[PDB]
Amino acid sequence: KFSGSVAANRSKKIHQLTKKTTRVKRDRKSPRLYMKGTLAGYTRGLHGQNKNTALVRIENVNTTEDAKWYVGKRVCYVYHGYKIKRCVRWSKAPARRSNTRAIWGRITRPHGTSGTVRVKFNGSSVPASAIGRRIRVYLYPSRI
Amino acid sequence: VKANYIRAGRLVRILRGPRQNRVGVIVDIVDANRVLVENPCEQKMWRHVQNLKNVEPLKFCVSISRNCSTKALKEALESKKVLEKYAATKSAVRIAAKKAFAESTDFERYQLRVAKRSRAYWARKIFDDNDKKNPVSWHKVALKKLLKNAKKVD
Amino acid sequence: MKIKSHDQITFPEDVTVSVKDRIVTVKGKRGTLTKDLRHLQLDFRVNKKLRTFTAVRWFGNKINNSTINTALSHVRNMITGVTKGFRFKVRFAYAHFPISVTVENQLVEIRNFLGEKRVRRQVVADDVKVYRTDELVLEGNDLEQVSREAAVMHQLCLVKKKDIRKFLDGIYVQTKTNIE
Amino acid sequence: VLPSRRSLNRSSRKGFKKHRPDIIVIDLKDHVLGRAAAIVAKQLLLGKKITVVRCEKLTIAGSEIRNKIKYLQFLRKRKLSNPKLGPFHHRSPSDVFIRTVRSMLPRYTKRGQRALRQLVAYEGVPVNVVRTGGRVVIPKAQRHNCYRNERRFTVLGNMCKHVGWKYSDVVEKLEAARIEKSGRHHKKMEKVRVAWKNARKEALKKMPQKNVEVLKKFGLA
RNA sequence: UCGUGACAACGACAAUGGAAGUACCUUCAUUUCUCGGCCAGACCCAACCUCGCCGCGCAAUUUCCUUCCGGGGCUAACAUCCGGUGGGUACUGUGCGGGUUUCGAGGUCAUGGGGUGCGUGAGUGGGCGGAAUAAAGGG
RNA sequence: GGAAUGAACCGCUUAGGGAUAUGUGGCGUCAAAACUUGUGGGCUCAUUCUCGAUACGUGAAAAGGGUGUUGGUGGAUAUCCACCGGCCCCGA
RNA sequence: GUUCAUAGCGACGUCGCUUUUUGAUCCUUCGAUGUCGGCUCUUCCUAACCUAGCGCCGCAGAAGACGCUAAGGGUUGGAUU
RNA sequence: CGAGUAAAAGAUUAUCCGCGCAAAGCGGAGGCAGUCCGUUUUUUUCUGGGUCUGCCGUUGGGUGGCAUGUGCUUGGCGCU
RNA sequence: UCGAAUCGCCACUUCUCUUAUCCGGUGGGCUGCCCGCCCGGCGCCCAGUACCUUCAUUUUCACAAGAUC
Ligand SMILES: [Mg+2]
Ligand SMILES: [Mg+2]
Ligand SMILES: [Mg+2]
């Protein structure tokens, strides 16, 4: 039912339990440089929605004055397709080729009083399959 | 039951106003949910109206009468040295610490990060060598069980 | 609204009263009693040196202020129960058919009430002691318990389908008196 | 759920052992039913996975007689020509919470159906949820910030009993068993908690003299 | 209207329809290939639109403030309140301002540019050049 | 474009499109907006067709009662009487 | 109503509810919605005749009047038409 | 390929079983050689004898139980 | 076979109860003041505050060109 013999397993555990000290997990890998947001939906009223503008809720803002810090920042939505298509640095960096794709946009102005922002996604509009999914809010361009 | 009572001469701290986290002494009571607050030993904090939903009573009290003069209140506060005692309280130090973190300049934030890491390392070193003698952790306790179990067969 | 409404009752010596989160315990020579007052929302305190029990309501209307006296009455009754106890006496009033009552430990049987073959049965709670003398006597520490057993006994026997002015047969309570 | 041989074989080739999605566990004891449902429903639409426990401790404003009558009025509604097609009257407290949340979602689109799929709604704290992590509460619906003290309120479990629920004794028997096991375990490891506390103390006087001052300035030492 | 091969998928909202994207298909059209009518990012000029910070005028700040008394009131007093005495010299209103011998910033995927570089492709500027140094107009 | 729904009510009146700001109506979820705003006052508890809550909309209610609770007015005595409102309850 | 307004009733007045009668209207249907009664069969309402539980009487017993909660169950066979 | 058990409880479920409260503590475990693998702690496997407790399939013969044509249990043969 | 979206984790959190309640518990003195007593953590670039130590031409943003599963 198990692997190895009863011997050389009792000795293995004794050797592992000794020499053991207090060691913790340290995050020394590549860092994250963006804030996490969610796509609430599109601007709308009781008559219907208008898909040329999107509403994004960011973590730890909860205030209009905090949302004003993020006006002009760049925003992207990350998803995957079903084969490898062309990408930036397709020939200079072949390791980048993947099914991953990104749709970019910018933050125009705050929405409401609770820290929601308005986003315009370049020329086109974001697909409706992104509603409820992760949105990346980067720290550039920076005024600070 | 165990609440501090609202009365003339009771120190309070403001909750959500423009003068947030500031201390002053109640000087009078008008109706059920309004008082007059004043603190003559601190900038701003002149006599003003304050809702009773915006204050929290403290443990310190000063013997004064209702509608007392500003010079009388100033004399009473310095005689009892009540303001100094509040500054020594743990609740005041926690509030002062949070204000210091909000003003940090990303270099003192690094210095605090170094200080916390140094303490965490030394705590780990202290915890060990008290686990070798009188074992307490999950692994060191199981080591005794393993060694005794293997004594008979080996 | 009133800023404060208060009242107090004095309890004698050799009796200990304690309160903890609107739960009152009173100790005496005949035992201890406990009452749950978590449904009242009042401010209870005891002095333990002046021997007084105080209840305060702070910002209340008429409905909120009317529970101060009700709470104080209950604590007074508990003190009067843990010392000198309570005792009730009931009487059997039969005109023609002599009704019979039998007490077997904690069980009571009533027979021959108004010429009926049905046997009425009642089980008395443990905290209330019952014994027979034409006199049925119930005694205990809790006035509320003792009074409720007498009420159950009286309601067991009633006249049905007959003029209640002409027919006046039943069980009635005569004397309320402390044990000592 | 129930990984087939296709799933186990793929995990064997790839080398994967276990995976756990990000889930929030909410303790629903002493929570207003309507206010908690409204807060949770909006969070579901925002792409969150939520498990709620102790659904029998939810509270409703009013007396038990008033709320029991309200349910009996709901139970009276049924399709006269074929009651097996009519509205369904669930009886367990956890099913009542899910029905309340469902009425606060767009339930006739794929977006709302997917959101409702992300809620679990247990009764009590089951064995597979005990050791996952710390539970959370919703301060906006905690019923000690919501109800005036003198107003009567209903406990959902008591009301769900007397209208058809028949597992109240099972739930309370399992809950009492959990308390004893959790209480015994928590009293254990008091030595290691004290040892760690006695390690952070006396760590000072071993650190360099400058890092202790920085700790004191920020109110951490 | 039907058969066959290939493919696309699709629960139950009868289908069809509108708008806006996306995933796969394109025997379609146009452009480019050592400069490109391709995709992004930042910068400049003009225009428009915002935010910070600093102020002004008016009797608006006297039905008011402060002292010393006589009533009155509470508790030993003080205070709330009413009459007098001498001093007076952040404040619940209303109409407005502020970058060029310079008051600090932001945005335009919501605008036009040759983006100072050739010729008739007309920088009009308190802002670009040249001169001069309190020049007239206020407290 | 609003009043869930409605020829006629409210707002507004219409070439094809962006940015900004409004009207009527709104800001617990459905459903955009106070992530349940105020460092604003009071009143109300409604047990079986189930308290109340967007005018037009009689798209449902009367006479008559109730110290249930919260306010006024006019008289005696240091609490009593008479009368009139608000919300809730019976009449239903 | 032995005296007794209100056990039970209640004139002269006045306030309502229902749509199970008959009127009033003329909105839908005249390139058609099969027009009375009975037979058969299911379901709903309560303004309660019987069955359950209570209060009250001008309720001694028996037999009844009135009122409340109650629609779970029941409510017949025939002569003439 | 988009992973949530009203399941267990540990070298991150791996590296053995039994009693015990997610305790204190208390019990059991067969040795040798080869091949192919092997960055370690009696490394990970595959065979051959190697002596076997517990087993499957047998032989009859003596019992014995069940409701009595069909299965078992005791007592020896060799045997996997 | 699979190129994929997601980007904290912990045998110190992963027990319970109250909110008219000593909010860490807990006594005393004279109906509110005064006086005593005892006891989340890590993680963010030397395994640790200290000397030492390779980062490139991927030479100005682009899914982290890296991880987890
Ligand atoms: Mg919303
Ligand atoms: Mg026809
Ligand atoms: Mg027909």
PDB file of C-alpha atoms (C1' of nucleotides) in Angstrom, chain E residues 13-131:
ATOM      1  C1'   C E  13     -36.688  31.235 -22.695  1.00  0.00           C
ATOM      2  C1'   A E  14     -40.806  28.987 -30.106  1.00  0.00           C
ATOM      3  C1'   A E  15     -37.677  30.861 -33.830  1.00  0.00           C
ATOM      4  C1'   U E  16     -36.549  35.221 -36.602  1.00  0.00           C
ATOM      5  C1'   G E  17     -34.649  40.516 -35.346  1.00  0.00           C
ATOM      6  C1'   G E  18     -31.217  45.152 -33.306  1.00  0.00           C
ATOM      7  C1'   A E  19     -26.499  46.901 -31.104  1.00  0.00           C
ATOM      8  C1'   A E  20     -21.572  45.987 -29.625  1.00  0.00           C
ATOM      9  C1'   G E  21     -17.365  42.636 -29.052  1.00  0.00           C
ATOM     10  C1'   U E  22     -15.093  37.997 -29.097  1.00  0.00           C
ATOM     11  C1'   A E  23     -13.624  32.566 -30.783  1.00  0.00           C
ATOM     12  C1'   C E  24     -12.771  29.910 -35.086  1.00  0.00           C
ATOM     13  C1'   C E  25     -13.125  30.044 -40.790  1.00  0.00           C
ATOM     14  C1'   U E  26     -12.261  32.598 -45.159  1.00  0.00           C
ATOM     15  C1'   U E  27     -10.936  30.238 -53.983  1.00  0.00           C
ATOM     16  C1'   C E  28     -12.500  38.288 -51.113  1.00  0.00           C
ATOM     17  C1'   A E  29     -10.228  43.321 -51.661  1.00  0.00           C
ATOM     18  C1'   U E  30      -6.236  46.889 -50.602  1.00  0.00           C
ATOM     19  C1'   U E  31      -1.161  48.157 -48.651  1.00  0.00           C
ATOM     20  C1'   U E  32       4.018  46.919 -47.403  1.00  0.00           C
ATOM     21  C1'   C E  33       8.606  44.190 -47.693  1.00  0.00           C
ATOM     22  C1'   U E  34      14.489  48.508 -46.244  1.00  0.00           C
ATOM     23  C1'   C E  35      11.462  51.534 -46.779  1.00  0.00           C
ATOM     24  C1'   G E  36       5.821  50.996 -44.742  1.00  0.00           C
ATOM     25  C1'   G E  37      -1.566  54.004 -46.107  1.00  0.00           C
ATOM     26  C1'   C E  38       0.631  48.655 -40.137  1.00  0.00           C
ATOM     27  C1'   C E  39       0.504  48.343 -34.184  1.00  0.00           C
ATOM     28  C1'   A E  40       1.910  50.737 -29.720  1.00  0.00           C
ATOM     29  C1'   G E  41       4.407  54.512 -26.227  1.00  0.00           C
ATOM     30  C1'   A E  42       6.258  59.174 -24.766  1.00  0.00           C
ATOM     31  C1'   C E  43       7.254  64.370 -26.064  1.00  0.00           C
ATOM     32  C1'   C E  44       6.107  69.718 -28.391  1.00  0.00           C
ATOM     33  C1'   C E  45       2.730  73.936 -30.101  1.00  0.00           C
ATOM     34  C1'   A E  46      -2.354  75.896 -30.145  1.00  0.00           C
ATOM     35  C1'   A E  47      -7.391  75.253 -28.159  1.00  0.00           C
ATOM     36  C1'   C E  48     -10.766  73.570 -24.570  1.00  0.00           C
ATOM     37  C1'   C E  49     -11.809  71.634 -19.671  1.00  0.00           C
ATOM     38  C1'   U E  50     -10.466  70.667 -14.291  1.00  0.00           C
ATOM     39  C1'   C E  51      -7.916  70.624  -9.297  1.00  0.00           C
ATOM     40  C1'   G E  52      -4.908  72.603  -5.466  1.00  0.00           C
ATOM     41  C1'   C E  53      -3.188  76.866  -2.745  1.00  0.00           C
ATOM     42  C1'   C E  54      -3.733  82.274  -1.533  1.00  0.00           C
ATOM     43  C1'   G E  55      -6.872  86.439  -1.131  1.00  0.00           C
ATOM     44  C1'   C E  56     -10.545  91.088  -1.406  1.00  0.00           C
ATOM     45  C1'   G E  57     -14.981  94.576  -0.659  1.00  0.00           C
ATOM     46  C1'   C E  58     -19.480  95.754   2.420  1.00  0.00           C
ATOM     47  C1'   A E  59     -21.565  98.366   9.897  1.00  0.00           C
ATOM     48  C1'   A E  60     -21.599  91.271   7.847  1.00  0.00           C
ATOM     49  C1'   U E  61     -18.788  90.884  12.272  1.00  0.00           C
ATOM     50  C1'   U E  62     -22.618  96.062  18.600  1.00  0.00           C
ATOM     51  C1'   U E  63     -30.213  93.133  19.329  1.00  0.00           C
ATOM     52  C1'   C E  64     -22.881  91.678  20.577  1.00  0.00           C
ATOM     53  C1'   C E  65     -18.146  91.197  24.139  1.00  0.00           C
ATOM     54  C1'   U E  66     -15.725  92.425  29.012  1.00  0.00           C
ATOM     55  C1'   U E  67     -15.584  94.492  34.124  1.00  0.00           C
ATOM     56  C1'   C E  68     -18.131  96.580  38.950  1.00  0.00           C
ATOM     57  C1'   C E  69     -22.902  96.663  41.495  1.00  0.00           C
ATOM     58  C1'   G E  70     -28.308  95.658  42.775  1.00  0.00           C
ATOM     59  C1'   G E  71     -32.288  91.827  42.100  1.00  0.00           C
ATOM     60  C1'   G E  72     -33.074  86.539  41.407  1.00  0.00           C
ATOM     61  C1'   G E  73     -31.585  81.441  41.612  1.00  0.00           C
ATOM     62  C1'   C E  74     -28.825  76.916  42.895  1.00  0.00           C
ATOM     63  C1'   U E  75     -25.519  75.029  46.406  1.00  0.00           C
ATOM     64  C1'   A E  76     -20.616  77.254  50.131  1.00  0.00           C
ATOM     65  C1'   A E  77     -20.478  79.376  45.682  1.00  0.00           C
ATOM     66  C1'   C E  78     -20.611  79.693  40.399  1.00  0.00           C
ATOM     67  C1'   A E  79     -23.840  79.348  36.359  1.00  0.00           C
ATOM     68  C1'   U E  80     -29.005  79.998  33.364  1.00  0.00           C
ATOM     69  C1'   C E  81     -32.145  85.090  33.911  1.00  0.00           C
ATOM     70  C1'   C E  82     -33.391  90.719  34.732  1.00  0.00           C
ATOM     71  C1'   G E  83     -31.919  95.928  35.550  1.00  0.00           C
ATOM     72  C1'   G E  84     -27.892  99.521  35.750  1.00  0.00           C
ATOM     73  C1'   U E  85     -21.795 101.234  35.692  1.00  0.00           C
ATOM     74  C1'   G E  86     -17.183 102.182  33.300  1.00  0.00           C
ATOM     75  C1'   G E  87     -14.594 100.107  29.246  1.00  0.00           C
ATOM     76  C1'   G E  88     -14.885  98.000  23.749  1.00  0.00           C
ATOM     77  C1'   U E  89     -12.206  97.990  19.063  1.00  0.00           C
ATOM     78  C1'   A E  90     -12.700  80.217  13.689  1.00  0.00           C
ATOM     79  C1'   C E  91     -17.460  83.661  14.411  1.00  0.00           C
ATOM     80  C1'   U E  92     -24.351  81.286  11.301  1.00  0.00           C
ATOM     81  C1'   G E  93     -24.545  87.112   5.922  1.00  0.00           C
ATOM     82  C1'   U E  94     -23.746  89.065   0.943  1.00  0.00           C
ATOM     83  C1'   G E  95     -20.899  90.415  -4.045  1.00  0.00           C
ATOM     84  C1'   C E  96     -16.259  88.864  -6.007  1.00  0.00           C
ATOM     85  C1'   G E  97     -10.857  87.839  -7.379  1.00  0.00           C
ATOM     86  C1'   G E  98      -5.407  85.483  -8.441  1.00  0.00           C
ATOM     87  C1'   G E  99       0.667  83.367 -14.007  1.00  0.00           C
ATOM     88  C1'   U E 100       4.171  86.613 -18.228  1.00  0.00           C
ATOM     89  C1'   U E 101       9.937  91.780 -15.268  1.00  0.00           C
ATOM     90  C1'   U E 102       5.589  85.510 -14.137  1.00  0.00           C
ATOM     91  C1'   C E 103       1.056  81.994  -8.270  1.00  0.00           C
ATOM     92  C1'   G E 104       1.627  75.317  -8.186  1.00  0.00           C
ATOM     93  C1'   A E 105      -0.309  71.082 -10.910  1.00  0.00           C
ATOM     94  C1'   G E 106      -3.686  67.727 -14.099  1.00  0.00           C
ATOM     95  C1'   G E 107      -6.613  65.739 -18.573  1.00  0.00           C
ATOM     96  C1'   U E 108      -8.100  65.312 -24.026  1.00  0.00           C
ATOM     97  C1'   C E 109      -8.612  56.872 -27.311  1.00  0.00           C
ATOM     98  C1'   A E 110     -13.255  63.748 -26.117  1.00  0.00           C
ATOM     99  C1'   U E 111      -9.722  68.473 -31.069  1.00  0.00           C
ATOM    100  C1'   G E 112      -6.058  70.481 -35.135  1.00  0.00           C
ATOM    101  C1'   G E 113      -0.704  70.341 -36.659  1.00  0.00           C
ATOM    102  C1'   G E 114       4.576  70.625 -41.543  1.00  0.00           C
ATOM    103  C1'   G E 115       4.226  68.457 -35.615  1.00  0.00           C
ATOM    104  C1'   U E 116       9.843  74.883 -37.468  1.00  0.00           C
ATOM    105  C1'   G E 117      11.332  71.150 -40.775  1.00  0.00           C
ATOM    106  C1'   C E 118      11.427  73.292 -48.831  1.00  0.00           C
ATOM    107  C1'   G E 119       9.796  76.948 -52.203  1.00  0.00           C
ATOM    108  C1'   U E 120       2.927  81.357 -51.655  1.00  0.00           C
ATOM    109  C1'   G E 121       2.075  75.490 -46.526  1.00  0.00           C
ATOM    110  C1'   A E 122       0.675  83.485 -43.774  1.00  0.00           C
ATOM    111  C1'   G E 123       3.738  80.891 -35.316  1.00  0.00           C
ATOM    112  C1'   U E 124       0.257  87.779 -34.454  1.00  0.00           C
ATOM    113  C1'   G E 125       1.815  86.136 -29.030  1.00  0.00           C
ATOM    114  C1'   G E 126       1.283  90.101 -21.662  1.00  0.00           C
ATOM    115  C1'   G E 127       3.033  83.820 -24.483  1.00  0.00           C
ATOM    116  C1'   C E 128       7.551  84.712 -30.464  1.00  0.00           C
ATOM    117  C1'   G E 129      11.635  88.548 -31.562  1.00  0.00           C
ATOM    118  C1'   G E 130      13.927  93.762 -30.525  1.00  0.00           C
ATOM    119  C1'   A E 131      14.378  97.802 -27.072  1.00  0.00           C
TER     120        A E 131
END
